[PDB]
Design an enzyme around this catalytic site. Structure first.
Site, PDB file in Angstrom:
ATOM      1  N   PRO C 161       0.783  -1.223   0.000  1.00  0.00           N
ATOM      2  CA  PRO C 161       0.000   0.000   0.000  1.00  0.00           C
ATOM      3  C   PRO C 161       0.827   1.291   0.000  1.00  0.00           C
ATOM      4  CG  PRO C 161       0.134  -0.797   2.220  1.00  0.00           C
ATOM      5  CD  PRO C 161       0.879  -1.795   1.361  1.00  0.00           C
ATOM      6  N   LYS C 186       4.774  -5.422  -6.025  1.00  0.00           N
ATOM      7  CA  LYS C 186       4.161  -4.322  -6.786  1.00  0.00           C
ATOM      8  C   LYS C 186       3.875  -3.206  -5.813  1.00  0.00           C
ATOM      9  CE  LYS C 186       0.230  -2.098  -8.312  1.00  0.00           C
ATOM     10  NZ  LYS C 186       0.696  -0.865  -7.618  1.00  0.00           N
ATOM     11  N   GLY C 239      -4.487  -3.246   1.831  1.00  0.00           N
ATOM     12  CA  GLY C 239      -5.228  -2.164   1.184  1.00  0.00           C
ATOM     13  C   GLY C 239      -6.693  -2.256   1.519  1.00  0.00           C
ATOM     14  N   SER C 240      -7.535  -1.781   0.613  1.00  0.00           N
ATOM     15  CA  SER C 240      -8.967  -1.714   0.880  1.00  0.00           C
ATOM     16  C   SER C 240      -9.578  -3.109   0.893  1.00  0.00           C
ATOM     17  CB  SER C 240      -9.681  -0.859  -0.167  1.00  0.00           C
ATOM     18  OG  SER C 240      -9.524  -1.422  -1.458  1.00  0.00           O
ATOM     19  N   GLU C 262      -4.485  -7.962   4.507  1.00  0.00           N
ATOM     20  CA  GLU C 262      -4.648  -7.023   5.618  1.00  0.00           C
ATOM     21  C   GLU C 262      -5.434  -5.859   5.055  1.00  0.00           C
ATOM     22  OE1 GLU C 262      -2.040  -8.846   6.220  1.00  0.00           O
ATOM     23  OE2 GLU C 262      -2.080  -9.082   8.442  1.00  0.00           O
ATOM     24  N   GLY C 264      -9.111  -3.021   5.497  1.00  0.00           N
ATOM     25  CA  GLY C 264      -9.554  -1.896   6.308  1.00  0.00           C
ATOM     26  C   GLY C 264      -9.961  -2.226   7.744  1.00  0.00           C
ATOM     27  N   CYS C 296      -4.902   1.604   8.669  1.00  0.00           N
ATOM     28  CA  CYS C 296      -5.898   0.547   8.794  1.00  0.00           C
ATOM     29  C   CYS C 296      -6.477   0.434  10.220  1.00  0.00           C
ATOM     30  CB  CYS C 296      -5.259  -0.784   8.367  1.00  0.00           C
ATOM     31  SG  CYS C 296      -3.720  -1.183   9.239  1.00  0.00           S
ATOM     32  N   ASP C 345     -11.072  13.313  -1.960  1.00  0.00           N
ATOM     33  CA  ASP C 345     -12.501  13.435  -2.286  1.00  0.00           C
ATOM     34  C   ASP C 345     -13.372  12.583  -1.361  1.00  0.00           C
ATOM     35  OD1 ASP C 345     -11.954  15.202  -4.364  1.00  0.00           O
ATOM     36  OD2 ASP C 345     -11.960  13.647  -5.906  1.00  0.00           O
ATOM     37  N   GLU C 393     -14.915   3.230   6.660  1.00  0.00           N
ATOM     38  CA  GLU C 393     -13.525   3.626   6.888  1.00  0.00           C
ATOM     39  C   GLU C 393     -13.282   4.956   6.165  1.00  0.00           C
ATOM     40  OE1 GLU C 393     -10.180   1.351   4.919  1.00  0.00           O
ATOM     41  OE2 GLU C 393      -9.504   1.231   7.020  1.00  0.00           O
ATOM     42  N   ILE C 394     -12.919   5.991   6.918  1.00  0.00           N
ATOM     43  CA  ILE C 394     -12.701   7.328   6.348  1.00  0.00           C
ATOM     44  C   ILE C 394     -11.296   7.410   5.764  1.00  0.00           C
ATOM     45  CG2 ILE C 394     -12.626   9.812   6.826  1.00  0.00           C
ATOM     46  CD1 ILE C 394     -14.623   9.134   9.194  1.00  0.00           C
ATOM     47  N   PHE C 395     -10.322   6.931   6.534  1.00  0.00           N
ATOM     48  CA  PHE C 395      -8.912   6.970   6.139  1.00  0.00           C
ATOM     49  C   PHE C 395      -8.440   8.421   6.040  1.00  0.00           C
ATOM     50  CE2 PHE C 395      -5.443   4.338   4.128  1.00  0.00           C
ATOM     51  CZ  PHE C 395      -5.507   3.328   5.072  1.00  0.00           C
TER      52      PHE C 395
END
Ligand SMILES: CC(C)CCn1c(CN2CCN(C(=O)c3ccco3)CC2)nc2c1c(=O)n(C)c(=O)n2C
Ligand SMILES: CC(C)CCn1c(CN2CCN(C(=O)c3ccco3)CC2)nc2c1c(=O)n(C)c(=O)n2C
Ligand SMILES: [Cl-]
Ligand SMILES: [Cl-]
Ligand SMILES: [Cl-]
Ligand SMILES: [Cl-]
Ligand SMILES: [Yb+3]
Ligand SMILES: [Yb+3]
Ligand SMILES: [Yb+3]
Ligand SMILES: [Yb+3]
Lengths: 494, 494, 494, 494
Positions: C161, C186, C239-240, C262, C264, C296, C345, C393-395
């Site tokens: 991530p 990656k 990630g998500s 792993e 949110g 996370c 956004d 999850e706002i993050f």
């Protein structure tokens, strides 16, 4: 590649090491340290006694107190200090190997390429365990939360032998420190020097004071003080089975301190008719002659099946006749001296029993040189089980070769000893390899090899060859003390 | 529900048990077994001596030989035999609990509901480990395949105490048998009877002969024979620290056999001002008075913070004044006798020191009854650290209550003993619970409880309270011997 | 001490890394890398696609072949390479932390003092496991010798991530390499730069070619190529939860490769009335605002008992009003930007839902600055369970504070989510600490703290927050594949 | 000794089992159960669908709630219930084996002597693990106390195959229940009967309601409902690789539930010229023909070194020509039918490809009888790697024998498959045994044997033959969920 030291070795560290400082003996007494190849004095070192052991134990006890730097630092930081110490030993590899060779009568190539490599690798292995020592959470009956702590035991007395001074120092201090103990180390009276240099490096690496204390001195004084001390929690000892018995007794009579012992051997090899013969000859040879035979795991009884016995003896004798005796520092020299007079006398006395009890002398059988404690590499064939050379640990360059026809019988003969440190099995048969190795009463069994020892494997004896294991995952157990904590709770859930 | 035996107990098994048969003593001698509540003789039992221990060791050695039924049977089948033995003990629960109560002076409710339940549960726990004892495969340096076998050690001598004869028999034989050892068991001279009944059930369950051998007899004769035997691989002992020292010495002087010891205690409790007071009083009470105080883990020093000390003492004294002394078989009786005269004398002598050294007697302080070894339940307050009753294991119904103001100081006082078996901490503070339990030098620490012991948890002492651990996963370690097997291969791959 | 880089950072490594060499993309295409604080282009990097992933997988497959250098080297040597890599990262600590801060919008103090320290410590931890990964020897029924090998799985695809690029790279490659796997990595399209520098250090440390391959590129192209590849044995992704679902599906549809995820969180804290209030406020604050909320484990639902709720909110708001927004490289700046426009956004849209759904805005609630993706640190009180800000999850730097009166009810509310990564419990009650932490459906539960993550502890989610665990002893399991080897023997012995 | 049932089998349990009660299907629909030897209907069973799976999941969720009887009972008591269940299965051994034979087309001798023995032994093994599942205490960096709980995961969906209905039911429920999970089990549509009888015994043993729920029904309906359910935490499936892929996809698309799969194989044997030839022939024979070839581990590619190939084929063909086909209940009958028409058709289609693609038919090659799904035992020699019979799992009595000259090449050929469940190596060479077994990409490798499976060993596939392991210590991991609990403390000590 065998690099060497470019300047003469100067001896610097000769004092008692307590709380990261250098101390004179309370007595003011010193004792001489000799080179076994020349019989010359190398230096004088401070002689530690009960009074000095007491100072070292007080220092180790204080460094172990709850709230101290060594108790409160992160486990990973104990690991870091140990990896730093390995880097420092690596930095001083040339001087340490030279010192080891000069003080210990050890071939410099082996000192540099094996002993020092082993010290560094073992320290690095131990460093990796420090933050991986874990207890358990346990699903006890009833409404309780139960966990265990694998705590360090506390102050560990560690008595180091003269045959592998640096390797055995690290085999002792590596796991003990990784687990969070503090130590009082008594190097062999014959070989205190490399330990004292390592002490200088412990200070340099940044270990808190009192975590490692090194008290050179004698067995019956400093060693007995350690084994009988009322505030030492655990004693580790490598050496003779005879002294091992005294250590265990003294621990019992004093404070019931924990005891681990790595003691003598009379380790057997069993060579089946189907074995790769050359491979068996070479491993059995190195197995008994390594470091002038001064190894606990010496392959000191080689049982060979009748049909290949003569060929085995011949090939063994030709390998044994190829040594070049001399100063262990000179390149190309392939056999150094024995450590001292007592060992030298014992070896010669045992060689005489072999002759007198009717073993067949194939080569060697006497001393060598005008100076040094040199023994000719010796081979005996037609050895029988009642002979002194078949029962007693020689701890010298003396190979015993015996014949067998019955596998049942030879396993009984192999097992018919109070010793039990190691054994070798040479065969191409899968079933025999597994079944013979299971049946042998020995701590390590090698199959189609011999003398293969690594940091990752536990090592130790069955029977009177020792109590406990060193190294590997299992070896770390004997440097912890398990505490169970059980907490009342209103309701447990799985 | 407390069911009882419907017919008088008849004693059947009174002989030495070797190779699944009943033997007279080589001497032909027998010794009396008494009931401690009446002082009456219950029966005579064959007296085993060195000569009889030798027969039992030979039987255990033979049952341990490579190729024997006990060595070759599936691990899961060792487990099956142990689960069968637990079922048989469950079947004979009423008679065993009665016998235990009658021979051991143990309250029948406890004998039936706790001791017998614990025997059965512990055996079942151990049965589950049998085929789950595993070694390792190890990524050694170099081109080798290395694995370890966690083998049984061999013949294990096991000396059982009189305070929990059946429970301690099972704590010893359960793990030893699960791991594949053979055993020579010496029950306490005071309490051989329940062990001999269990031997009848070992035969019935189908254990191969010589796997379990039971030799009733005396400590200085049969016990010393075990501890000094040249062909016993390991000795396990529970009892006094004093005898523990003799066992460890004798193991050292003889054959360096492995030794595990569970010995005395002088276990402390620390009761903080914020503790649930009633909960602390009740647990500390049962903690010291359980089985007439005849427990290694007796909570024999209770340190209470000054501000709640008076209230703690008052509440403790009122709980201690509620006992009903008598025959441990009669329902409603809540305190039985001490085991014998020696123990009775020692307790009374120690109670006298408390009075004479100036402790405050709150209740009790003398004997009770015209027959039996009964001691009034006794409480002392204002005890100080130098008093005999604060330093010596009483092993009787005698509670010591002390005050403290400083937590630093009380932890030092708690730790200021050569003992280290257990401890209790009573507080509502999370941080204190964790930090105090970490700082106490004790094998088991209870938080807001006391005396909670289960098969799933390792149990044993720090310092002179013992060497090694019993039960749990960790306890199974001291009944195995690790063998490393290292095989030369052409090329290894991860 | 916060040292800094003395010269401007120059970007050097911008290409695909396969077989220890730098490759252009098969396409010849490149993609831009931006700084989120300035919105400026930092450089162009080669865009990897399916065609490039195929080259990397072929390289990793070849490096994993039996007989290769990576398969045949000693486990301890894999460890050595990893410790060397940690030393090199330590050497380049200033440049890596600067690069991380500049590319990732991460506060430089945190980048240097936390992220880089964590990378180095985690690598060192993993290095220590390499030669301590062991299988078992097993007492199987019947006449067999059975052992297990814990082999590496093979080629592992690892998708990293953008929030902790370097830390997560090391959390992935450390265990995978320690266990002997080869990897195709990656990095996030937003943050490829630090990974490519680490690749230069992998080459320098001496890893064999093809052991680590790094392919920068996009999720729907390079990431999808990895997840769908027929010759990748295992995929690890952080990630998500949304993308996690696509990875797991693609693994199923392709070659049933192993998957660890792993994902949110919507992690809750429960603050009891008896909690140390200031300690709870500070940990819950850092818990949600760390790295601009881009964690996370963000403590994104804080449940506080009614009687201390108002005081908690007040103290929280005053802590949240103390930030200094700006360029994460400038000393004293305490909040950097969000990573990119999409995240920016999403955060602003969610903040608007809080306002519109009737949460009480205590501070923040809008954007900040003329450049960069900055969001004012935002606090909402009186949040209810149905609100978007309570479910999604706002993050981002957005704290939700809710009240409760019933402990039963609040545990249900805490657990009433498809997420399950972590949770916090703040109380002085021992029983509550243990029982609440047991009842919470979360992978890590902190008691009287939050966000405490270390190499020694396994980390991962319950429910839709992930599959599997990373780090600790347990995390190493998902990078091995167990092989059982069962050998017929004539007769087994225990 | 092969005892038999003395009265005709009457079918009793034919309904859905939820909360320890018998339910009709929500639909009211039922489906027929056939005997594959006669093609006759045995009975009708309630057809479970999504609606019924929902009821079972709700029951399992409720039984898993914190504070429930299954969550709060002692781990040792979960073990007790499992040992009780094994005793009950032992009691009903004759009826279960008959039912298994009649419903499953399984030879009664095997059903009674192997399948039932395996069920009982596996249950007993699992029972022993229940109170031995432990977490850890971990020496984390910083002033924290960190421990882990190895909790049960929760509601586990378990889809059981038709080939070993009872064995696979127990392989699934044994570990899941031992670890404290609750289960929703979907037996194969072909073979629901023995599972429903076991359900009656789960009720009798005293398991709390909702701990085990059994929903007979079809794969695309009930199985798909399980795999796609939003409140099932984990799915375990044994069956075709094809359906395995659908399960893994559905888990990804729904709730990211944990997935373990045991799928098909195309398992190879490698027979070296030095092998004990008769031993290799017999094991390879049983290896492929066991249970009419309906085993995942079928030895379906036998590679034999050129010089012994002809002799191997001859000896194999003579063993294969000795079967007696018929009703699996009649004594002396040695081959039963295939399970159903689909399997029967697939087998016959594959046998036709062998003929048409140019394999050499040595014996068999067609159907047998006027009723039942019988296939003649078939041997093909001169099979090449591109043939359908060399690539596709046949799951029938069809043996493939191939030749090789190069060991390098044959290992590549052995590994050149997407499957990877098991393999066999036959040789007298120690080095070859170890190196070949290391190089084979297979979950279990047998040396000088085949098809040796025990409760103590982990079992599962490499590659597309599965994800995860069952049984042994390692298999218990995939039925736990690890939770890390980290507690702030004032000061930690080692
Ligand atoms: C047990 C002692 C007496 C072993 C002394 N010894 C050695 C050299 N050793 C010392 C250094 N040691 C290590 O610490 C280590 C850690 C990792 C790799 O090595 C390895 C073993 N090589 C030997 C022998 C040996 O005693 N015998 C009999 C032989 O035949 N050979 C070949
Ligand atoms: C260590 C010995 C001396 C403990 C004797 N003892 C007992 C009863 N025990 C005997 C049976 N034992 C088990 O084997 C077992 C296995 C599974 C569950 O229990 C449990 C402990 N209860 C006690 C005490 C005790 O010594 N003290 C001080 C107390 O306060 N209580 C409550
Ligand atoms: Cl433990
Ligand atoms: Cl081990
Ligand atoms: Cl394993
Ligand atoms: Cl864990
Ligand atoms: Yb001389
Ligand atoms: Yb009297
Ligand atoms: Yb803008
Ligand atoms: Yb038909």
């Amino acid at each position: 590649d065998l690099p060497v030291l470019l300047t003469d070795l100067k001896i610097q560290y000769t004092k008692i090491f307590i709380n990261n400082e250098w101390h004179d003996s309370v007595s003011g007494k010193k004792f001489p340290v000799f080179n076994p190849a020349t019989e010359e004095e190398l230096c004088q070192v401070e002689e530690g006694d009960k009074e000095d052991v007491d100072k070292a134990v007080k220092a180790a006890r204080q460094a172990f107190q709850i709230g101290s730097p060594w108790r409160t630092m992160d486990a990973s930081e104990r690991g870091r200090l140990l990896y730093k110490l390995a880097d420092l030993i690596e930095r001083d590899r040339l001087l340490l190997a030279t010192m080891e060779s000069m003080n210990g009568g050890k071939l410099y190539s082996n000192a540099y390429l094996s002993d020092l490599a082993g010290c560094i690798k073992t320290l690095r292995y131990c460093a990796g365990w420090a933050d991986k020592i874990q207890g358990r959470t346990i699903p006890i009956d009833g409404n309780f939360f139960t966990y265990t702590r694998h705590e360090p035991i506390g102050v560990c007395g560690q008595i180091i032998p003269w045959n592998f001074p640096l390797v055995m120092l690290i085999w002792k201090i590596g796991p003990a420190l990784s687990c969070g103990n503090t130590v009082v180390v008594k190097p062999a009276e014959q070989t205190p020097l490399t330990a004292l240099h390592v002490a200088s490096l412990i200070k340099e690496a940044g270990f808190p004071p009192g975590v490692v204390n090194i008290v050179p001195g004698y067995g019956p004084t400093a060693g007995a003080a350690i084994s009988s001390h009322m505030d030492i929690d655990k004693v580790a000892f490598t050496g003779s089975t005879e002294v091992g018995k005294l250590i265990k007794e003294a621990a019992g009579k004093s404070n019931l301190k924990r005891v681990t012992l790595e003691l003598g051997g009379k380790s057997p090899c069993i060579v089946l008719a189907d074995a790769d013969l050359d491979n068996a000859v070479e491993f059995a040879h190195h197995g008994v002659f390594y470091h002038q035979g001064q190894c606990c795991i010496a392959a000191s009884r080689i049982f060979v099946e009748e049909s290949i016995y003569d060929e085995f003896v011949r090939r063994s004798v030709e390998r044994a006749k190829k040594y070049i005796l001399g100063n262990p520092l000179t390149p190309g020299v392939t056999q150094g001296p024995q450590i001292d007079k007592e060992q030298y006398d014992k070896i010669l006395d045992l060689i005489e029993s072999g002759k007198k009890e009717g073993a067949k002398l194939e080569c060697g059988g006497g001393p060598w040189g005008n100076k040094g404690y040199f023994v000719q590499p010796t081979v005996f064939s037609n050895v029988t089980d009642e002979m002194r050379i078949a029962k007693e640990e020689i701890f010298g360059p003396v190979q015993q070769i015996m014949k067998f026809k019955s596998l049942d019988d030879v396993i009984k003969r192999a097992n018919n000893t109070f010793y039990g440190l190691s054994a070798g099995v040479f065969t191409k048969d899968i079933d025999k390899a597994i079944t013979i190795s299971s049946a042998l009463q020995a701590g390590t069994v090698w199959v189609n090899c011999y003398g293969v020892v690594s940091a990752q494997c536990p090592f130790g004896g069955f029977k009177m060859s020792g109590n406990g294991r060193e190294l590997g995952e299992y070896g770390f157990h004997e440097y912890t003390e398990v505490k169970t904590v059980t907490v009342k709770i209103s309701q447990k859930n799985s």
